[PDB]
Every structure is written in C-alpha cells, then in structure tokens.
A paper describes a structure:
The N6-threonylcarbamoyladenosine (t6A) modification at position 37 of ANN-decoding tRNAs is one of the few modifications that are found in the three domains of life. In the first half of the reaction, YrdC utilizes ATP, L-threonine and bicarbonate to synthesize an unstable intermediate TCA, whose threonylcarbamoyl-moiety is subsequently transferred onto the adenosine at position 37 of the substrate tRNAs by the cooperative action of three proteins [name], [name] and [name]. In archaea and yeast, the transfer reaction requires the kinase, putative endopeptidase and other proteins of small size (KEOPS) protein complex, composed of Kae1, Bud32, Cgi121 and Pcc1, complemented by a fifth fungi-specific protein Gon7 in yeast. It is now well established that [name] and its orthologs Kae1 and Qri7 are responsible for the catalysis of the transfer reaction. [name] and [name] are forming a heterodimer that is capable of interacting with [name].
We wanted to test the pertinence of the ADP bound at the [name]–[name] interface using two mutants, YeaZR118A and YgjDV85E. The crystal structure of YgjDV85E–[name] in the presence of ATP showed no ADP-like electron density at the dimer interface. The mutations of two residues that contact this ADP molecule (YeaZR118A and YgjDV85E) did not confer any effect on the heterodimerization of [name] and [name], nor on the activation of the ATPase activity of [name]. The ATPase activity of the ternary YgjDV85E–[name]–[name] and [name]–YeaZR118A–[name] complexes remained unaffected and the latter is fully active for the in vitro biosynthesis of t6A.
Author numbering:
A (entry chain D): 1 to 228
B (entry chain A): 1 to 332
Write the structure that this text describes.
C-alpha cells in the first residue's frame, strides 16, 4: 500500500509518502508561498523515493479546518492529482492530524486542538486515542469564541495536551479550566501525521472518488448581509 | 492538438475542450447567478467555495461529452487573472496539478485575452490587424491588435466599465443583478427620443471612456419622472442608446486612427443586440467588417480559455510547477 498525503491548510506546506511501512516526509513553513512550493514538494517526494504518481493507492489531503484559501489549495491540488492519476481520496482533519502528532512526539492520548480561526475565534476539537489507536472526537469539531471554549473545558476532566496556533494566540485559553494542561509540542499539522490516519481509513474502505472530496470549513457564516 | 480550458475567474465555472482540427469538442458551464443575486454582488468567499464544488465534475462531464480520455489532451489551460484571487486559485490549482498528473504543459491564460479571442470560435474569424472593443463587467478598453500577444492600449475607462454602468442603472430601475440584459429587454419597449442622455467624452478628441456621469444623469431622470412601465422603458432605451452611441463613436475614432478595417468586439456587453446592430451597420458603411462571438461566448465561458490557451501554448507560454495567480494583470 502506497499513500500520498498533502497539507496546505495552515502556514505549513507538507507532503509525506507511506510505502507499505516506510515513511518519507517533508515539511516547511510557506507563508505566502503555498502555491509556489506545493507541487515541487510533491515532485521531489516522488523522485527521492523513486515512486510515480501512478503507483499511489490513495491520496490523502488535509480537508480543513484552517485558512479558507489554504484548505482550497490543498483540495484543489489533491483533486488535480487524483483526477489525473485516477486515485481515490482520503480527507483528514487538520485538528486530528495535530493530535496524531502529539501522540507521535510524546505519546499524548488526550488532545485539545485549537487553531486560530481569526475573527477572535478558534477551531476546536477534543481528541482521545483509544487502545486500538483510533482517535475519537470528530463530532466535537467546531469554531468557537474563547469564552465558549472556556465553558466547554469546565465540562471536561483530567489531564490533556494542547496543540495548535489557537493556544499561541490565546495562551490563557485554559485559565480557570479545572484541567491539567500540558504543551503538546505541535503548532501545525504535518502530512507525516496524516499517513497513519489515512492508512486506517483506507483499511476501512473509507475513501472517495475525486468528485466527492469535500473541504471542511467550520465557519460558514462568510457573507455580507443579503439585500432586503 | 487539443487543449482543456478552465475558467474560474469570478462567478462562472467554465470548462471546455478545443481541438485545432475539429473545433470545440466540449463546453460546460455553471453560472452562480442565483447564489450572488441575493447579495447584489459577488461574495468572494462564496464564489470560491462554489468553484470547488463545480470544477472537477465539469471536467469529467467535458471528457464524457467529448468521448475523449486523458491521453487525448495535449495541454491544460487555466485563467490566471485578472479576477478574484480566491476564485482564480481553484481553477489554477486543479488545472496545474491535473497537467502535472497527465504530464502535459500547463498554460496560464489572461482572462481578457480570453474574451478578445472568443470571436475566433466562429466561422470566418478575423485576421490581424484589428481594433478590439473589450466591453465587459469590469473592463472597457479599445485595443490595437497587430498579432498574437501584440496588444496596444488605445483607450480605456477612467471610471466605471460599461458593464457595471448597465448593472447600476438596471438596479435603479429595480431589476435583478446583473440587469444588463434585463435593462436591454426593457429598453426594447421604449420610445426613441423621449429622453436624451449625454454621450460621455465625445465632445473632445481622444479614445478614453467615462460612464459615471451618465449613471447619475439616468438616476436623476428616474427620480424626476413617473415610475409607470412605459416611462421606465423610455429611460432604459435612452440609456442604452447613449452607451451604444458612445461606444460606436469611440470605435469609429479608433478605426480612423489605426486605419484598420476590422472591428472585433468582445466581453459581455458585446452580447447587447443594439450594439451588435450598430457596429455591424457602421462597418458596412466603412466597407469594413465587424466580428463578435455568439451571445453565450461574449460573457464568461471556458470555450474562450481553451482557445486562448491553445494560442498561448503555440506562442510558447507554459508554466513551471509553481502556481501563481494575478488578480490584477494588465493586458496592454
Ligand atoms: N445584453 C446585454 N446588454 C448589456 N450588458 C450586458 C448584456 N449581456 C451581458 N451584459 C453585461 O456583461 C457583463 C458581464 O460580462 P462578462 O461576463 O464578460 O464580465 P466579467 O466575467 O465580469 O469580466 P470582467 O472580469 O472584465 O468583468 C455584465 O455587467 C452584464 O450585465
Ligand atoms: Fe469576463
Ligand atoms: Mg462572470
């Protein structure tokens, strides 16, 4: 099984390749350069691992949330590749990706992901890894004001790890929460961390044809007022 | 050869395939008018989102419509600008990664060059050189065209484009956005001469345009006259007749100045029936020739991008792996 993953949902661009076990991965900050670096990085990862696009079994993309523009770059690039090489696609949550990264880095199994969404809000999720390595919490994904995050945290218990730029923009987000909070050491999603999630989704038959690939935006109220 | 063209500059998603032996093999279009009507304008974020939903499926329908497969396409063209950054990025990212996966050349196309070349999709297209009147939603320009990629700016609007002037006056008349075509359907019922509007920038030499004062002139007339159906029509006709005579006069001056005998008209306003008749008449009396596209190719479409990508490819304009769009991107 070969899986190719790409992510441009945040200030990072990353690509990663899974070859039946061995991982090859690149990651970099690309503020204002996503569209310039992404396809060169795909090319390089394919050539350095001596694999061609036609030998990939599935294409995993960062489906959101994040920068609207970044999320669309990601899905657009993934769709072009998948349409062109007739690849099935696997959409991976940006918040879940960062949780997988905290697991990889320090074995965290309870992750509070917060992404700065702008507009004084964050993209929020509560992910918990089960004994079989499955992440639970997809249903908790939401865009929320910091005061609402505060109230939600007071309904949680115990010990959690923090990941995402939302904690960086609001370092007191977890103040008076009642939880023990530790830094998860993950600011941004990495395509490397999509691969294990994408691997499990592929095993479950949970892939889609290119025309069904969907972005997840979370903030949907994005229009100026309608006319009378 | 065959080129797949992708247009996502604003609020239309267009996909087409153009074959330089057999012509246009596929044309697919999704207009977002319903979505933006509610807002009285295009919401960039909503336009961007809808392109994501339409682009891939319209590409698939195009290949289905043409009975072609991936190996039959020699290049992928996509609009790189001008237009809305967020919309442009959808077409350009799909288009550029698609070309990478098919391993064929990727062609960034200038949206206005797309409009300019649309009349080349009809029988007996224009030879160089010619004057071109680009009259669209956000552009109004006169251009001396002496060859491929050889564009010289003769004149342009210093304020509103003619398309927007139609839209603004149409809204004042209480019509749905964009009302250009609707205003035009209303004008047909009006009696010529009932009101007479100014022909802006015609009492001095020069090839530039202005439409802002004409808008106010019509707005003042609407305010100080009856809102009955016949009076509304008389105003729409005076306005359209003013715009059409202005463009005609400027085209005349541009033909006089260049000495060319061919007039090419492009962009959405060139679907206007009064304007087509007026410019055809003028070119008849000059013993010259007018060229324009079928109405559905005057406004946005992918056909014009597949053609213009074909032309840009033959002229050597290909993209590296980096993708860039240019929201503002001067033609000439
Ligand atoms: N029959 C008509 N009479 C007058 N104006 C018309 C007619 N048909 C279309 N238009 C105008 O053409 C404009 C849109 O044409 P077009 O699609 O070329 O603009 P566009 O895609 O926005 O290009 P640009 O980016 O330069 O604005 C609108 O303002 C519309 O009302
Ligand atoms: Fe246009
Ligand atoms: Mg348009």
């Amino acid at each position: 099984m070969r899986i190719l993953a790409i992510d441009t949902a945040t200030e990072a661009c990353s690509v990663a390749l899974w070859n039946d076990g061995t991982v090859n991965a690149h990651f970099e900050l690309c503020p204002r350069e996503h569209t310039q670096r992404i396809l060169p990085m795909v090319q390089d990862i394919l050539t350095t691992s001596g694999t061609s696009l036609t030998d990939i079994n599935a294409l995993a993309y960062g489906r959101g949330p994040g920068s609207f523009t970044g999320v669309r770059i990601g899905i657009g690039i993934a769709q072009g590749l998948a349409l062109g090489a007739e690849l099935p696609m696997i959409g991976v949550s940006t918040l879940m990706t960062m949780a997988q990264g905290a697991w990889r880095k320090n074995g965290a199994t309870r992750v509070l992901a917060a992404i700065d969404a702008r507009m004084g809000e964050v993209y929020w999720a509560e992910y918990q890894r089960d004994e079989n390595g499955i992440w639970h919490g997809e249903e908790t994904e939401a865009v929320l004001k910091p005061e609402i995050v505060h109230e939600r945290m007071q309904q949680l218990s115990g010990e959690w790890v923090t990941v995402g730029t939302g904690w960086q923009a609001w370092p007191d987000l977890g103040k008076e929460s009642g939880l023990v909070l530790r830094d998860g050491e993950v600011l941004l999603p990495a395509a490397e961390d999509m691969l294990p999630i994408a691997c499990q989704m592929f095993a479950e038959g949970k892939t889609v044809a290119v025309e069904h690939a969907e972005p997840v935006y979370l903030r949907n109220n994005v229009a100026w007022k309608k006319l009378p | 050869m065959r080129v797949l063209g992708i247009e996502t500059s604003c609020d239309e998603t267009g996909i087409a395939i153009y074959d330089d032996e057999k012509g246009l093999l596929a044309n697919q279009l999704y207009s977002q008018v319903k979505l933006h009507a509610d807002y009285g304008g295009v919401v960039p974020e909503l336009a961007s989102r809808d392109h994501v939903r339409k682009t891939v499926p319209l590409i698939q329908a195009a290949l289905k419509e043409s009975g072609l497969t991936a190996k039959d396409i020699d290049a992928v063209a996509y609009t790189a600008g001008p237009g809305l950054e967020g919309a442009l990025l959808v077409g350009a990212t799909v288009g550029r990664s698609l070309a990478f996966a098919w391993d064929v050349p990727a062609i960034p196309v200038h949206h206005m060059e797309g409009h300019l070349l649309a009349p080349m999709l009809e029988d007996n297209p224009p030879e160089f050189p010619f004057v071109a009147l680009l009259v669209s939603g956000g552009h109004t320009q006169l251009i001396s065209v002496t060859g491929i990629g050889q564009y010289e700016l003769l004149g342009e609007s210093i304020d509103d484009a003619a398309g927007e002037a139609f839209d603004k006056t149409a809204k004042l008349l209480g019509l749905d956005y964009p009302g250009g075509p609707l205003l035009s359907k209303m004008a047909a019922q009006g009696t010529a001469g009932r009101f007479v509007f100014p022909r802006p920038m015609t009492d001095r030499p020069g090839l530039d345009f202005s439409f802002s004062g004409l808008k106010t002139f019509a707005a003042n007339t609407i305010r100080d006259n009856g809102t009955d159906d016949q009076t509304r029509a008389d105003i729409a006709r005076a306005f359209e007749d003013a715009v059409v005579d202005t463009l005609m006069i400027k085209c005349k001056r541009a033909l006089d100045q260049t000495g060319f005998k061919r007039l090419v008209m492009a962009g959405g306003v060139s679907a206007n029936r009064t304007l087509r008749a007026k410019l055809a008449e003028m070119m008849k009396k000059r013993r010259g020739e007018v060229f324009y596209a079928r109405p559905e190719f005057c406004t946005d479409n992918g056909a014009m991008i597949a053609y213009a990508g074909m032309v840009r490819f033959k002229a050597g304009a290909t993209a590296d792996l980096g993708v860039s769009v240019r929201p503002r991107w001067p033609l000439a």
